[PDB]
mmCIF file of C-alpha atoms in Angstrom:
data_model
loop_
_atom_site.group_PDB
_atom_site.id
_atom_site.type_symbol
_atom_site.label_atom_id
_atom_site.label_comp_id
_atom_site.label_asym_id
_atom_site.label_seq_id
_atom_site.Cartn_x
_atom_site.Cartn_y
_atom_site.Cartn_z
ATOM 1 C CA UNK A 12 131.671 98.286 54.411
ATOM 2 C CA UNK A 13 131.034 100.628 57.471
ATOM 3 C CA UNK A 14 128.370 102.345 54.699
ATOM 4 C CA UNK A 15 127.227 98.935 54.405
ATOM 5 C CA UNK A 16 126.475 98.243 58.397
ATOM 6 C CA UNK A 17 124.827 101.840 58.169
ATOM 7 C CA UNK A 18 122.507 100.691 55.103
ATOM 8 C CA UNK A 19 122.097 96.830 56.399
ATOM 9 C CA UNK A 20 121.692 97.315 59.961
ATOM 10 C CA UNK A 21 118.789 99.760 59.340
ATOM 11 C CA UNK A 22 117.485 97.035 57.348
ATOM 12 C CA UNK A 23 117.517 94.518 60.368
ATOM 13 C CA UNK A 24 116.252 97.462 63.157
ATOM 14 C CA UNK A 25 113.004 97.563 60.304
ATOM 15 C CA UNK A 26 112.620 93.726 60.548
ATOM 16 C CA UNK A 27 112.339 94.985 64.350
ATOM 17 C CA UNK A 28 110.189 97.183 64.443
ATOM 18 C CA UNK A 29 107.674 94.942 61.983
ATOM 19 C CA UNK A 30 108.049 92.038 64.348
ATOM 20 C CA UNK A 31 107.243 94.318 67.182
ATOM 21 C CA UNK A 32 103.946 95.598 65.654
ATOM 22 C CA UNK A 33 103.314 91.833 64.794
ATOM 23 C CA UNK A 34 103.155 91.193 68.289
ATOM 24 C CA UNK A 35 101.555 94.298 69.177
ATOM 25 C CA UNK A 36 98.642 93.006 67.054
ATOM 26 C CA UNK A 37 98.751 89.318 68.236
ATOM 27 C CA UNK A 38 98.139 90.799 71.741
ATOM 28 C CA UNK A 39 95.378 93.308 71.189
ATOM 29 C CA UNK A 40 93.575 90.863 68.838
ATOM 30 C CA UNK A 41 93.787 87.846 71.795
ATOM 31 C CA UNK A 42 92.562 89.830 74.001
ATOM 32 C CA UNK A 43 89.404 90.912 71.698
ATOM 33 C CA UNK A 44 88.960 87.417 71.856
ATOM 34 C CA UNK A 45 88.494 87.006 75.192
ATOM 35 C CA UNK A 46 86.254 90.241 75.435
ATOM 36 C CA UNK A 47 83.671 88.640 72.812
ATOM 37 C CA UNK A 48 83.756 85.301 75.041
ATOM 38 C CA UNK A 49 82.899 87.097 77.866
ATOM 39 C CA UNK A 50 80.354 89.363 76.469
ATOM 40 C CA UNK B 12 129.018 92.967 55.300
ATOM 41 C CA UNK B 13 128.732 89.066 55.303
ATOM 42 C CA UNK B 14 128.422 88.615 58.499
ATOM 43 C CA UNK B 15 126.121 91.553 59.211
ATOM 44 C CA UNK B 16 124.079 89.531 56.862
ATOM 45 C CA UNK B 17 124.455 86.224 59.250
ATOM 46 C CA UNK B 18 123.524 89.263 61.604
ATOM 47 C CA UNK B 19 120.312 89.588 59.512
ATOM 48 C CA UNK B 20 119.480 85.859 59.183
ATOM 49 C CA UNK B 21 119.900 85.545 63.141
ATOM 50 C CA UNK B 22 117.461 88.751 63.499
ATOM 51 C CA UNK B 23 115.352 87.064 60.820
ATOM 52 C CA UNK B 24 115.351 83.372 62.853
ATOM 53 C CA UNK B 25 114.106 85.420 66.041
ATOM 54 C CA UNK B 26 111.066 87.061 63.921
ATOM 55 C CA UNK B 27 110.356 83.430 62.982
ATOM 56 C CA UNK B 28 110.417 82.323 66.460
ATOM 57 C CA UNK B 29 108.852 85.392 67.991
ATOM 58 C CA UNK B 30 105.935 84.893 65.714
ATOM 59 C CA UNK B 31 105.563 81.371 66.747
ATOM 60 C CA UNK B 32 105.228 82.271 70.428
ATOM 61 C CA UNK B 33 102.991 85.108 69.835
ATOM 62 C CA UNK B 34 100.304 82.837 67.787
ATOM 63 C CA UNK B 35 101.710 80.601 70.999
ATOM 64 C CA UNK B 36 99.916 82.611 73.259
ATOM 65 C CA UNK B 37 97.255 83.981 71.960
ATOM 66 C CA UNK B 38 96.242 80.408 71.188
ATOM 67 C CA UNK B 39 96.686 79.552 74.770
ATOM 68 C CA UNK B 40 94.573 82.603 76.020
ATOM 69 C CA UNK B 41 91.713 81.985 73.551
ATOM 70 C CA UNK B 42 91.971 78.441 74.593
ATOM 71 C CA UNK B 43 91.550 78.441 78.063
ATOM 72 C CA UNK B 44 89.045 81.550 78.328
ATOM 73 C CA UNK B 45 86.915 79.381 76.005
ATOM 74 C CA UNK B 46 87.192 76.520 78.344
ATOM 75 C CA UNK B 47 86.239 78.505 81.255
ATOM 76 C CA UNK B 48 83.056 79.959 79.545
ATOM 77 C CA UNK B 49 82.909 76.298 79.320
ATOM 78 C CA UNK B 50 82.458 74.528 82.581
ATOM 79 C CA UNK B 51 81.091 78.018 83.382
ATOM 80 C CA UNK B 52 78.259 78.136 81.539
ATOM 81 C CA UNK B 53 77.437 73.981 82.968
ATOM 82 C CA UNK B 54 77.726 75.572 86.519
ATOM 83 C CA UNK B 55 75.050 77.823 85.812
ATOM 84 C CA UNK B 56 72.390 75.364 84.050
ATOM 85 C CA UNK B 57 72.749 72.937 86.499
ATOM 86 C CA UNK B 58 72.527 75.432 89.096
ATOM 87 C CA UNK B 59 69.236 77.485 87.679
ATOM 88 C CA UNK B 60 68.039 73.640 87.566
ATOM 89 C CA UNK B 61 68.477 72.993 91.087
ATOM 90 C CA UNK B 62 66.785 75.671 91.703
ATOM 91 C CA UNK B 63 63.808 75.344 90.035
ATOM 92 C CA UNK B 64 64.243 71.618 91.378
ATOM 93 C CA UNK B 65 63.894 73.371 94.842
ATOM 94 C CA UNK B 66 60.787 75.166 93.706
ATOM 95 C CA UNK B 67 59.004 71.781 92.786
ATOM 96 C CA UNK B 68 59.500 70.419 95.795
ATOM 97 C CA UNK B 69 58.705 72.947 98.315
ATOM 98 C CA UNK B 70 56.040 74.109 96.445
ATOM 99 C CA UNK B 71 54.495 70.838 95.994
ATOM 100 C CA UNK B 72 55.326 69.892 99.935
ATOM 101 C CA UNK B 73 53.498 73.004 100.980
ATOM 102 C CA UNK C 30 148.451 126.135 88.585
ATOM 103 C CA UNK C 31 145.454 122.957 89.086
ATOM 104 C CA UNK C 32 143.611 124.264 86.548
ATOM 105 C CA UNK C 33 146.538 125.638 84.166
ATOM 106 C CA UNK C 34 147.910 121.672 84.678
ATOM 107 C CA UNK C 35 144.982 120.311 83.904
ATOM 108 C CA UNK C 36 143.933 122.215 80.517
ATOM 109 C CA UNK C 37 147.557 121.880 79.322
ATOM 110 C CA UNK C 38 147.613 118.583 79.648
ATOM 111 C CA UNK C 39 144.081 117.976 78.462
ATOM 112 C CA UNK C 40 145.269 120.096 75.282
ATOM 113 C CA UNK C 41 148.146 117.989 75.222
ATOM 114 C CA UNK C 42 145.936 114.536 74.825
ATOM 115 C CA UNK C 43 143.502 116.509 72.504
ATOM 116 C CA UNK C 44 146.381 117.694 70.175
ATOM 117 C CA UNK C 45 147.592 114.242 70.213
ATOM 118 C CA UNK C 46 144.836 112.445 68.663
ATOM 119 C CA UNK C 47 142.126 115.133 67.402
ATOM 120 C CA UNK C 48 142.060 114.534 63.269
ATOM 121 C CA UNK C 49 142.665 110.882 64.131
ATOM 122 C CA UNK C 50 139.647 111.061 66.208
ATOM 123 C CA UNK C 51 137.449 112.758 63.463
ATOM 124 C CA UNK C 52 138.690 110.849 60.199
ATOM 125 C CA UNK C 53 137.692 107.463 62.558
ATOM 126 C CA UNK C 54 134.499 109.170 63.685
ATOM 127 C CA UNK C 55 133.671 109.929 59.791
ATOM 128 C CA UNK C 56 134.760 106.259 59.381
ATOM 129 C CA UNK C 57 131.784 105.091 62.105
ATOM 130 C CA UNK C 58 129.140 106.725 60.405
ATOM 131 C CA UNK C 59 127.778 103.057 59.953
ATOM 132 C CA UNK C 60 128.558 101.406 63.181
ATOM 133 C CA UNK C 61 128.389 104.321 65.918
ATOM 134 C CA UNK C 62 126.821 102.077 68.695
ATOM 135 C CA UNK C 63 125.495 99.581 66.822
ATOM 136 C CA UNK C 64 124.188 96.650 69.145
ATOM 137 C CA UNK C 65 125.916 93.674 66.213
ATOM 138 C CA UNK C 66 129.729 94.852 66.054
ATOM 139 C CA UNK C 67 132.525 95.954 67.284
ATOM 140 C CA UNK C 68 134.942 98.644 66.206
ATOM 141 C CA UNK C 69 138.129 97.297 66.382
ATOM 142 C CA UNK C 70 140.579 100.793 65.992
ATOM 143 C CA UNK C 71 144.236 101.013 65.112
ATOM 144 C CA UNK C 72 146.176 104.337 64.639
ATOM 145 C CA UNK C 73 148.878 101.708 63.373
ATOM 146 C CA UNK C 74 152.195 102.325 61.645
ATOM 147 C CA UNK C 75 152.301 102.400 57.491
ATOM 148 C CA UNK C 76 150.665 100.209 54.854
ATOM 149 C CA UNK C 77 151.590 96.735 56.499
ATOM 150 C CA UNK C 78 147.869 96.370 56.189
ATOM 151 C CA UNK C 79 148.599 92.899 55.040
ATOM 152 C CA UNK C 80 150.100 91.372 58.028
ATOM 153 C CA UNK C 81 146.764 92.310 60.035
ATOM 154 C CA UNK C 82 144.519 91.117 57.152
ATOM 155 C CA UNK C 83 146.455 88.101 57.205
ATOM 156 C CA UNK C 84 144.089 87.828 60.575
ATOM 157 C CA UNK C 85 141.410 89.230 59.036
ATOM 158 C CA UNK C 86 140.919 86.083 56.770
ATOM 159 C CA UNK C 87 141.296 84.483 59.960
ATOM 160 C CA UNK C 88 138.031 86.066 61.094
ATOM 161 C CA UNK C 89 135.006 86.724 58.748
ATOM 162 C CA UNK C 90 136.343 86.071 55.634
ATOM 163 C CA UNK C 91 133.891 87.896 53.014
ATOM 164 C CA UNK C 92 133.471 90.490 56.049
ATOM 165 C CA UNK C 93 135.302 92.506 58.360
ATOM 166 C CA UNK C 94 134.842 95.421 57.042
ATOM 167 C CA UNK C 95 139.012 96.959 57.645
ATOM 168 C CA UNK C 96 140.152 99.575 55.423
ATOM 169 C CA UNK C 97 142.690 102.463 56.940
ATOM 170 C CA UNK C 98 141.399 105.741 55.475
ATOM 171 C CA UNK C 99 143.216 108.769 55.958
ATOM 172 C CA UNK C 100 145.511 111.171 58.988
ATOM 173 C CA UNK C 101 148.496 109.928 57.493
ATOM 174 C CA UNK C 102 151.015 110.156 60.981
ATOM 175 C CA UNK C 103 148.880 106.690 61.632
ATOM 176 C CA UNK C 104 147.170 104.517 59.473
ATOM 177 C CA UNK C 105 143.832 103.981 61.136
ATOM 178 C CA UNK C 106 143.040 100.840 60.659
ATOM 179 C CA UNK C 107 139.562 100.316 61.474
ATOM 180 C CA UNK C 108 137.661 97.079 61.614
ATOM 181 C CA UNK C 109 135.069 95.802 62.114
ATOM 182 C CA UNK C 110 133.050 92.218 62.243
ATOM 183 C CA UNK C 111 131.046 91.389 65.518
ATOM 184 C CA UNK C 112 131.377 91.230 69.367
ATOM 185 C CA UNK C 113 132.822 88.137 70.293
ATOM 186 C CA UNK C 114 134.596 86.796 67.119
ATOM 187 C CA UNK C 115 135.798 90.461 66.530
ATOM 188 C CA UNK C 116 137.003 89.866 70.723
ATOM 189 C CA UNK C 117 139.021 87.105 69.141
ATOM 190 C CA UNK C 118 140.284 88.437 66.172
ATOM 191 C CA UNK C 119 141.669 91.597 68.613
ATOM 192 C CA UNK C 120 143.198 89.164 70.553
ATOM 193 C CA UNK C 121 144.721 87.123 67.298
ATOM 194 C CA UNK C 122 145.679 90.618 65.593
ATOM 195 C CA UNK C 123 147.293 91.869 68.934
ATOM 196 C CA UNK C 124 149.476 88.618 68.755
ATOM 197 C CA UNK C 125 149.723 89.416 65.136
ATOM 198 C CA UNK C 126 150.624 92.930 66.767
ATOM 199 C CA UNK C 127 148.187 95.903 67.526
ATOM 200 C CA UNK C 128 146.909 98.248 69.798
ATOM 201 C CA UNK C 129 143.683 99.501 70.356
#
C-alpha cells in the first residue's frame, strides 16, 4: 500500500531510465548517420 | 496502488510518445542531411563542368 | 535565557510529536518524496477511520493507500493517492474533518 508505491514506483523510475537510454541511442545513432553522409 | 498503476500507464503513454519523437527526429536529421548532400553534390558537377567548359573555350580561343 | 528558551521550547515541540514522527516516517518508506503522490498525514483521534474513508471512496476507490498504524495517543492516519486529486480529497476529508 505504501510497500506497494515503494515496489511500483521503482517499477515506473525503470521504465525511465529504459526510455532514457532509448533516446540516448536514437541520438548517437542519427548522428552516425549524418557522419557516414558526410564522409 | 490503483492509481499508482494509472501512474504507470501515464509513465508508460509518455515512453510511447517519447519514442515517437525520437524516431521523429532522427528521421528529420537523416532526412534533411541527405537532402543537402543532395543539391550539394549537383552544385559541384555542374560547377567542375563549368569549369572545364571554361577550359574549352579559352583554350580553343587562344 | 535566548538559548535556554529556545532549546526548551524546541524540546517541547520535539517531545510533542517524536514517535508520531518515526512510526509515520516507517510508514513512508514507499512514498518519501516520490514525484506521483502525496502524503496526506493525520495524528487523528480513535478508530473513526470510517468517517474519513467514507472520503476515501470518494477519491481513488481501489487506491488510496490509508491505514493508521501505530503511537496510539493519535491514530495516524496516513494516506495517500496523488497530487491534485489527493489536494481534493484533503480538502473533502478536512470538511469531512481533519488536520494535517
Amino acid at each position: 500500500l505504501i510497500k506497494s508505491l515503494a515496489e511500483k514506483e521503482k517499477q515506473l523510475l525503470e521504465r525511465l531510465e529504459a526510455a532514457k537510454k532509448e533516446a540516448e541511442e536514437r541520438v548517437k545513432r542519427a548522428e552516425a548517420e549524418a557522419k557516414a553522409l558526410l564522409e | 496502488s490503483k492509481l499508482e498503476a494509472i501512474l504507470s500507464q501515464e509513465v508508460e503513454a509518455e515512453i510511447q510518445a517519447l519514442l515517437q519523437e525520437a524516431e521523429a527526429k532522427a528521421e528529420a536529421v537523416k532526412r534533411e542531411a541527405e537532402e543537402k548532400a543532395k543539391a550539394l553534390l549537383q552544385a559541384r558537377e555542374r560547377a567542375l563542368e563549368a569549369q572545364y567548359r571554361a577550359a574549352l573555350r579559352r583554350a580553343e580561343s587562344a | 535565557t535566548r538559548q535556554k528558551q529556545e532549546l526548551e521550547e524546541e524540546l517541547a515541540l520535539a517531545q510533542a510529536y517524536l514517535e508520531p514522527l518515526e512510526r509515520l516516517a516507517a510508514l513512508a518508506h514507499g512514498l518519501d518524496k516520490s514525484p506521483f503522490l502525496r502524503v496526506i498525514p493525520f495524528l487523528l483521534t480513535e478508530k473513526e477511520l470510517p468517517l474519513v474513508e467514507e472520503a476515501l471512496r470518494k477519491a481513488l476507490e481501489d487506491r488510496y493507500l490509508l491505514a493508521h498504524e501505530a503511537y496510539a495517543g493519535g491514530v495516524a492516519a496516513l494516506v495517500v493517492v496523488h497530487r491534485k486529486e489527493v489536494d481534493q480529497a484533503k480538502a473533502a476529508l478536512s470538511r469531512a474533518g481533519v488536520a494535517e
